[PDB]
Structures are given as C-alpha cells and as structure tokens.
Design a binder for this molecule. Structure first.
Ligand code: RPG
Ligand code: CL
Ligand code: MG
Length: 232
C-alpha cells in the first residue's frame, strides 16, 4: 500500500459516509438549553475517539513512543475537529456534518458552539473554495497532526514522517496537474494549517466561557485536556 493510499484510507474510514448521513435531528429553521451544551460536549468527545482511530491509521504514528502520540494527538485535536468538520460540511446550505454522520444546521449549533460555529462555517467556505481533492486533504489533515511540538521524545522521526507526507502531497499535486508544479498552490494549501490555530483558540474560548457559565460543566476528559493546555 502506498503512503497516500494509507492516508486516504485513514481519512475515509474515520469519516461518516455520504450514503448513511443522519437527518433525524436536522432543522433548517429551529425554534441556552443545558441540552445544547451537553450535545456540544458529546460532539467533542465522540470526535476525540474517531480522530484517535484516524491517527492510529497514519503509517508511522503508532511507531512513536506513547507520550509522543499523546502529545501530537492532544495538541492537534481541536485543529483536526475543525479541519475535518469544515471539509465534510456544506457551508452554502449551513449544513454541519459531524463525524458520527449527524447533520445539523448552523442555527442549531449556535446555542452549543456560540460564535465559534460561524467561524467554522466561514473557514469551511474558504477551504472548499480551494477544491482540495480527497488525496490532498488526507495529507493536509495528517500534517496538522504530524508536526513539530515542544518536548517530543523522537522529534527526528516525527520530522521524517512529516517530510514523507509533504513529498506525497507534492507529487500528488504535480501529477494531477499533468506533470507541472504548483508551488504557489501548495503554499496556499499548507497555509490553511496556521489558520487552524485561530479556530483552535476560538474553541478553547468557548469551553472557557461554558466552564465559567457553569450551567453544564465540561465532562472530565474535556476538562482535563482544557485545563492541562492552559498557560496558567
Ligand atoms: C490549539 C490552539 C491553541 O490555542 C491551543 C494551544 C494553547 C496555547 C498554549 C500556549 C502556547 C505556548 O506557549 O506553548 C491548541 C489546542 C489544542 C487542544 O486540542 C488541546 C485540548 C483541547 C481541550 C478540550
Ligand atoms: Cl472528526
Ligand atoms: Mg491556574
């Protein structure tokens, strides 16, 4: 199996299928609930598990020390939640498609996600305007996780894996352009990664707000990851 094939499989097998989406909760025009907050947390915790399975399907990832795996996964989690949500969704219709296949309107997400959902949809729109095929996306997603972080036990190995993925992506882009390079396109593509950082911080801000509001406290796994991430 080629590396890009393995990256595509990791992506496809960790995303809901277009042929089995769940519309049973969707409302194009719905009518503060503790319910919306709870669901917001459920969507984050359900997504953690699926992204963890995705990460374990990236060749080389399971070869890293357990601490390195945890560091990479935990540091990238919210970025990945946003990236994959934005790729899967239908921003023009205001349709968010979560990793379990549940389709919800933007207006349904507003009570749980606050403003952050609006930032997500905007980024989705910008991302989809770039016409990133499945193979290129699979590489980009991997690169949001397989990246330099401070305090890795095997940073050279992470860097080699990063470089292998970058080279897949490069060859893929060039091949799909009939053998000519697209170095500016590749730049714009990799430029989507720094933009995920802002979206991550906005997700942290939402959890911060909900924790302070204290109507529904975050569940232990979110609380722990949230608190451990804080510089204070
Ligand atoms: C995503 C972007 C962030 O702002 C956050 C890093 C936090 C900033 C730490 C200070 C910078 C430094 O000095 O190193 C990243 C969040 C990652 C997130 O997945 C952590 C777990 C989410 C909790 C639910
Ligand atoms: Cl996800
Ligand atoms: Mg403190």
């Amino acid at each position: 199996v080629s590396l890009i094939s393995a990256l595509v499989r990791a992506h496809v097998d960790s995303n809901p299928a277009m042929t089995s989406l769940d519309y049973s909760r969707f409302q194009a025009n719905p009518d503060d609930d503790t319910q919306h907050i709870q669901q917001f947390y459920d969507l984050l915790t359900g997504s953690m598990e699926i992204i963890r399975g995705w990460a374990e399907k990236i060749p080389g990832f399971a070869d890293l020390p357990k601490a390195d795996q945890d560091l990479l996964f935990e540091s990238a989690f919210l970025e990945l939640f946003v990236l994959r949500l934005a790729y899967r969704s239908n921003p023009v219709e205001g349709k968010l498609i979560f990793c379990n296949g549940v389709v919800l309107h933007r207006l349904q997400c507003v009570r749980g996600f606050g403003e952050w959902i609006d930032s997500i949809v905007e980024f989705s729109s910008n991302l989809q305007n770039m016409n990133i095929d499945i193979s290129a996306f699979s590489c980009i997603a991997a690169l949001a996780m397989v990246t330099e972080r401070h305090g890795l036990k095997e940073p050279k190995r992470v860097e080699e894996l990063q470089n292998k993925i970058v080279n897949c992506l490069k060859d893929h882009v060039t091949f799909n352009n009939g053998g000519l390079n697209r170095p500016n396109y590749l730049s714009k593509l990799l430029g989507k990664l720094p933009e995920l950082r802002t979206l991550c911080t906005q997700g942290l801000q939402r959890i911060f707000y909900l924790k302070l509001e204290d109507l529904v406290p975050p569940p232990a796994i979110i609380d722990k990851l949230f608190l451990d991430t804080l510089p204070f």
